[PDB]
Amino acid sequence: HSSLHPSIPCPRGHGAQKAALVLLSACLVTLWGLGEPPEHTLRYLVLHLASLQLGLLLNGVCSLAEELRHIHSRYRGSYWRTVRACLGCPLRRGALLLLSIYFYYSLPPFTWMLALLGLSQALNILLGLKGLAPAEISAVCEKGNFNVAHGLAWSYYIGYLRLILPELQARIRTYNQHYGAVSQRLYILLPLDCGVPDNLSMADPNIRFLDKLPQQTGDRAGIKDRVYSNSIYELLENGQRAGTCVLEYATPLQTLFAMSQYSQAGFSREDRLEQAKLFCRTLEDILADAPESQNNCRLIAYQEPSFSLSQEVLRHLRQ
Amino acid sequence: HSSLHPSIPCPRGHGAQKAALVLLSACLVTLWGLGEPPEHTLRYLVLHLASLQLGLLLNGVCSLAEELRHIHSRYRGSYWRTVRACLGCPLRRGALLLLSIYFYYSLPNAVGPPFTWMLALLGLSQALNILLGLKGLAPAEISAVCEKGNFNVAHGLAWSYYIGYLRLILPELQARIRTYNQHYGAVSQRLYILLPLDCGVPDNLSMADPNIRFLDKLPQQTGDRAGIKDRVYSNSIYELLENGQRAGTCVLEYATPLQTLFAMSQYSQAGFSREDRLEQAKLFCRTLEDILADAPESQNNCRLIAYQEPSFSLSQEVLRHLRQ
Amino acid sequence: HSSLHPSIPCPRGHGAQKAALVLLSACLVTLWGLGEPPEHTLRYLVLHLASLQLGLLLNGVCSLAEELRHIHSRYRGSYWRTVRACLGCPLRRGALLLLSIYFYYSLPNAVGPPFTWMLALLGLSQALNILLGLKGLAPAEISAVCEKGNFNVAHGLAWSYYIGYLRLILPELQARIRTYNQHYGAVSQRLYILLPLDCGVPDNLSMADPNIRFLDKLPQQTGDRAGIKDRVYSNSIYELLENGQRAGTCVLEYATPLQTLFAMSQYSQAGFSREDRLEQAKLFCRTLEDILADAPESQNNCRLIAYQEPSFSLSQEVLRHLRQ
Amino acid sequence: HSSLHPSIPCPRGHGAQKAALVLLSACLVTLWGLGEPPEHTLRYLVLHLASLQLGLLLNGVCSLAEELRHIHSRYRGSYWRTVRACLGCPLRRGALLLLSIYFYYSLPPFTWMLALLGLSQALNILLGLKGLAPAEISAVCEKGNFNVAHGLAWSYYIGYLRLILPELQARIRTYNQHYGAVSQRLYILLPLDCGVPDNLSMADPNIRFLDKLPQQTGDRAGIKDRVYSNSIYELLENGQRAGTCVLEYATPLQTLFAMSQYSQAGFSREDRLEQAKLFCRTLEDILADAPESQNNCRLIAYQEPSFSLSQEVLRHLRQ
Ligand SMILES: CCCCCCCC/C=C\CCCCCCCC(=O)OC[C@H](COP(=O)(O)O[C@@H]1[C@H](O)[C@H](OP(=O)(O)O)[C@@H](O)[C@H](OP(=O)(O)O)[C@H]1O)OC(=O)CCCCCCC/C=C\CCCCCCCC
Ligand SMILES: CCCCCCCC/C=C\CCCCCCCC(=O)OC[C@H](COP(=O)(O)O[C@@H]1[C@H](O)[C@H](OP(=O)(O)O)[C@@H](O)[C@H](OP(=O)(O)O)[C@H]1O)OC(=O)CCCCCCC/C=C\CCCCCCCC
């Protein structure tokens, strides 16, 4: 469970499997109560599974009709890779297919039923009856890591935080020697609504600006001088300075907001809120394990309901 | 169809629906030939669809158990949104469930068990599907769902690259190039972005090809971003050597997000494989190409270079686009 | 739900689908009670749906005749796009047409004629529907289609008002107000927009309410737009009288697009009725409210006043929002 | 047929009615050939129409379930207005409904068939089978004038062109007296792709800028001084001035482009192109009839494929 903010969803668990197990127990008890012959039960069950497997075969063929066009670009020119992409594993799938064919032909008309199954399966593709529910899609994305926020969080850590955080420790001490000493941490603001104004004082006038740390420079991706700059802010309580820290907005959140505005992005407000929460979770998880963040940085997540933002930083700064 | 590189896949098309239509026509012709009673055909088709709908109901009920745990964080604390996520649409799904229940209870059936026995078996089979994983999507179906939904990481990386870096710098780039030319051969008036589909992206460009060397940088651009008081955007100028003599000079850079894809491959915590890296690298190029095409700020002031290593041509690749 | 005024309609909801679900449940219960053979029920339901699909095919064929004339101008000169526009989706529609033809030819029927006789009658009835206009949409269905598709004129007017005027001026408005206050009681730091749902909008605001009078204008703002070298955006300052003494002063204007709606009502060539004017005027307010809510440039620097005349309160209405 | 550009679609005609008439003739000839009893033909036809009318009644009831919620806001608190909105005209609809009920009950089970019809109609709403085709929607919008471009064109004429064009004649002469005399017309550019750059020279360097006309001022909508300004441009051919005119981009086209970019607008690229063409057509039609445009303005529509834009203005300027 995340410690940043209550609104952050936890990773999905096994609850579906437990519900399926309860359903299995109930179904078996019901079959025991009904008193129908066990052999007929087994026959019907195996026939149903065989029919499902054959429907899977036909759906895979329909998908293969599409994937073969991409054979060169996506599948590097191998027909077998395309076939596996459509069927998952041709060996296991072929074994189950042969078993299903044998059992469905033996146990019982085969040809008429096969045609009826193909007709049913074709309508599923054309009508779209097998479109997955939002929860099913969300679970698939989270397990596979097919998420916008996943890439943004790793991009943020790999590029910015990985480089600057080690140097941050040295730079802050240099500033304190040159100059009221500032806290020895970088504080990152995570607005779950993705506000992120470019001037921090506009967010809260109690946060006012102070001189900058020494610039950090590095050679990167063919640009010989990438300059990394950090600003210092003072926090006002009762109208006087009550804290001083190096402060940031998570810039990737600004990308999520902009994606929500552009029509070409295909990115909605609901996607923005879900991905914003996900971005916080994965960034929290990575920094926990990351060697670079010994004690160097702090994450602050908040959700505006007259807001406390200045007090929010102070609370963690005092903490 | 992408113009950057032959290997970049085109967006998926309707071919699956065309194959489904061919299959449907063939199945109808086969039923016509078989000569079985039409009423039996219709009855059993409807019964199969009804059984599928009931299995969907039960699977959603199983899913609903997990989502109810997240109700407060993921679904705004409302039960209806949870049920909507699990079942897709309560009204349409309820209508189809009523139809399925009515027709399966009412109609005679010889291929399937009576209603209650059938329901017990259907729940048993759905529980087996859930526990064993017998219904998992194929990787091609997952890819189709992701590309239709825009769930890929490369989509987010490309949009971040456009919104943060290019959208700001490209407008100012013309003025900075004119200033550099007037203050000072004259650099070309475009920014050239290199896209290695293998995601190598060395920091020191000289390491990639000795025929590329570094000149004095463009004037720095500064702007206030995300609560940081103004920060530097900088660009480097390079000269290109043909047989050891300058054939061309240009403003040039690697696409930084490709380094993120490569690093994500190395880190175990990322759950990102090398196969994903190549797939997402191609998708990044395709997405960025589409963005810059429509983007008004990027009209003819930007150019993309995409290549894959087969002694490499890199310096010639940049020269090719410059003289073109 | 809009906050501007009680009379502004909320967006349409799902109530129609809920009523349809209630109807479906009642019909299923009625069929259950009637005790007629289930197979007859299923057969005749399927036959009715098949007849509807064939009628749709014929109607699309009739429509296709008109669209083929426009092929080059409206459909890029491609036949497939014309057929797509007429039939919606060739693949899905073809699948359903094959199903309909197969089942109607194959199944026995007592309520309808044999296949060819039925086809002749169905074409006759569809031709009558087209010629007589017997299938025209009700005005409520047209309104639902328009609001779902965003086909209303008020949508375009609101988006033009936001994109052209407010998006530019509102950011500069703060600096202009600060400049006016420093150069010089002090005007409030917000722009107030008046929205008469009757679309009166007189040019001279003093004519609307003598208690409103005009002060020295804000500094002019100039910018280059649409091939015109810089042009003036100007705003007027007003003072508000309570019992003949200044209670408040503000920057204020009528929403110009409402004059367009009123004028469109007067002009015969516009094909725009007074009933449409009131409907679109409310929709304009609702659309603008939604735009400014999400728009980042309009955060707390803009305010909307909406009212309908029942001796009018106008000056008090502005005062209400100022002190609030 | 529009004279601006070939790409502009003409208003839809009667072709559908002619096709329906041909279909009617073919169906009647087919019925004559089949030789089935005419009385059975009439009975079946009337029963089909009656069933369609009853389905219409039930659909109207389902819609009324929704519209009643809006009774106060949209329908000014009248139940009868809501009922008419759902049914179109309760008198004619009730007459046809009573006739349909009578004929369907008399001619033939009624109750079972009525329930089956209701079940069929309910599925149409829930499944959405009656969603109109794009061409049907487009025809409805064009006839009803439910279009974004319709409002934009009238807004452009009512506000800008109506006011300035009369004054334009006087102002141009004033400029010629003060000062190479410029053409006595306003030229408006209509890019069907909705490009519309803010600086015209950027579109084509052969178009260069020249001093402005005297400013026009007016009192408008509570703003005491609305200033209307027009710029003058010179056109280069063979590298020297070859023309001088007052030149404009149609600003509403810029709105269409921006709407295409914003996600909140629900406006696509295809909508942008269709509405851009429609905007040209309606603006062409209105100015033809409008009293104000005696000879004062010219419309130029072009569609970029290295473009001739400067030559395009010259061609019409020479014309
Ligand atoms: C009485 C019943 C009533 C019901 C209605 C039935 C009426 C059927 C009527 C008419 C058919 C339409 C006109 C035909 C002529 C055009 C064809 C062509 O000659 O065209 C063919 C066309 C190639 O063209 P292309 O070279 O341009 O490639 C384009 C590519 O397809 C696009 O791919 P995609 O759409 O995103 O998937 C891409 O997007 C696009 O890109 P770009 O933007 O550049 O244009 C281009 O590349 O596709 C094909 O080969 C597929 C052709 C086969 C698909 C047929 C579906 C199944 C149909 C019927 C079922 C019966 C089958 C078995 C029957 C025997 C019994 C078992
Ligand atoms: C064995 C079969 C398996 C198949 C599945 C069947 C299972 C059925 C199961 C469970 C039902 C769901 C839980 C029920 C408790 C919640 C209800 C509530 O108590 O709630 C009621 C809720 C009011 O609430 P509310 O005050 O919050 O108003 C909101 C409003 O509705 C929203 O309007 P809309 O959705 O855009 O149309 C607006 O958008 C939202 O706005 P906001 O954003 O502010 O929230 C709010 O205003 O609506 C209603 O009165 C409608 C209630 C009736 C609709 C029922 C549909 C027909 C259903 C079944 C057919 C059988 C009928 C006849 C049967 C007898 C035989 C003839």
Ligand SMILES: Nc1nc(=O)c2ncn([C@@H]3O[C@@H]4COP(=O)(O)O[C@H]5[C@@H](O)[C@H](n6cnc7c(N)ncnc76)O[C@@H]5COP(=O)(O)O[C@@H]3[C@@H]4O)c2[nH]1
């Ligand atoms: N070649 C190049 N030169 C630049 O100056 C530059 N600036 C940004 N970018 C790249 O474009 C995109 C925009 O960055 P964004 O701010 O949205 O996310 C950035 C941002 O959240 C953070 N970050 C990076 N640099 C800074 C910086 N100087 N100051 C504050 N935050 C920074 O870390 C994220 C990833 O940066 P990069 O992974 O190195 O590549 C970025 C990114 O892909 C640049 N690319």
Ligand SMILES: Nc1nc(=O)c2ncn([C@@H]3O[C@@H]4COP(=O)(O)O[C@H]5[C@@H](O)[C@H](n6cnc7c(N)ncnc76)O[C@@H]5COP(=O)(O)O[C@@H]3[C@@H]4O)c2[nH]1
């Ligand atoms: N109150 C107010 N003060 C202004 O300065 C102002 N400027 C524009 N607008 C209004 O915002 C909207 C956006 O204008 P757009 O340019 O996109 O369409 C404008 C534009 O295409 C054209 N037009 C109007 N004024 C000018 C002008 N000065 N110069 C060139 N074109 C103009 O005619 C259209 C309708 O103008 P109005 O219908 O009177 O109100 C406009 C409009 O509703 C203003 N509203």
Ligand SMILES: CC(C)CCC[C@@H](C)[C@H]1CC[C@H]2[C@@H]3CC=C4C[C@@H](OC(=O)CCC(=O)O)CC[C@]4(C)[C@H]3CC[C@]12C
């Ligand atoms: C399950 C199917 C077969 C039958 C359901 C019929 C009705 C009882 C359903 C249909 C749609 C439902 C409504 C759709 C929308 C809403 C808004 C929804 O919004 C909230 O207030 C909570 C969301 C949030 O927290 O933001 C609350 C439930 C409610 C009233 C629902 C209540 C139950 C309704 C009426």
Ligand SMILES: CC(C)CCC[C@@H](C)[C@H]1CC[C@H]2[C@@H]3CC=C4C[C@@H](OC(=O)CCC(=O)O)CC[C@]4(C)[C@H]3CC[C@]12C
């Ligand atoms: C009518 C139904 C029942 C059967 C149709 C089956 C096929 C013959 C159809 C299905 C989709 C069609 C294709 C879908 C997409 C295109 C792209 C389309 O694009 C263009 O080149 C013209 C558009 C333009 O002018 O931009 C040309 C037709 C084509 C090849 C179509 C040809 C005919 C196809 C293969």
Ligand SMILES: CC1(C)C(=O)N(Cc2c(F)cccc2Cl)c2cc(C(=O)NCc3c(F)cc(F)cc3F)ccc21
């Ligand atoms: C398309 C066609 C003709 C077909 O090929 N099958 C294969 C098949 C099964 F899928 C299932 C069992 C036997 C056969 Cl033989 C089929 C089945 C039904 C049916 O009524 N299934 C209910 C049902 C069960 F019988 C057992 C179960 F465990 C769950 C369940 F939901 C209707 C039509 C068909």
Ligand SMILES: CC1(C)C(=O)N(Cc2c(F)cccc2Cl)c2cc(C(=O)NCc3c(F)cc(F)cc3F)ccc21
């Ligand atoms: C739902 C139910 C039971 C019902 O209420 N009707 C009413 C009705 C008609 F709609 C049409 C005719 C008679 C009746 Cl009685 C119906 C009809 C059919 C059918 O086969 N229609 C073919 C068909 C025709 F018969 C004549 C025609 F001019 C065109 C056409 F397409 C199937 C099921 C039903």
